[PDB]
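The following record pairs a protein chain with its ligand, QB5.
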Amino acid sequence: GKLSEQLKHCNGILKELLSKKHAAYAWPFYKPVDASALGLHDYHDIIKHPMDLSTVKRKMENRDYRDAQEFAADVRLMFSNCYKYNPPDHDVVAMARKLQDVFEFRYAKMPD
Ligand SMILES: CC(=O)Nc1ccc(C(=O)NCCc2c[nH]cn2)cc1OCc1ccccc1
């Protein structure tokens, strides 16, 4: 089916985002932001819906995502949180923009 095939493409993208190829800029997005550990005591006041690649992986493994659009919304939420919280000149934003470039160009190659 179309939904299964498109979710296979989504799973391929997710594997790539977690791969050593992209680790130099992907690593801040591997696990939930530990706001308390990083001293970001305003993070959960500013970010209402935290998202990270480990949460996307768990949701994929649990068959939570019903279609490619739902998967993409979580990956883009993760990037949007980074752009909302951080000043645009911060290193983590540069890393987000590079990983989102990887994501958007491969997401565009969706079979349909
Ligand atoms: C996903 C996300 O937004 N993460 C982060 C947000 C704010 C800070 C944070 O502490 N910001 C203020 C201090 C700072 C600036 N540049 C690095 N640390 C560090 C963050 O992730 C860890 C990190 C560390 C080093 C480089 C990239 C990501």
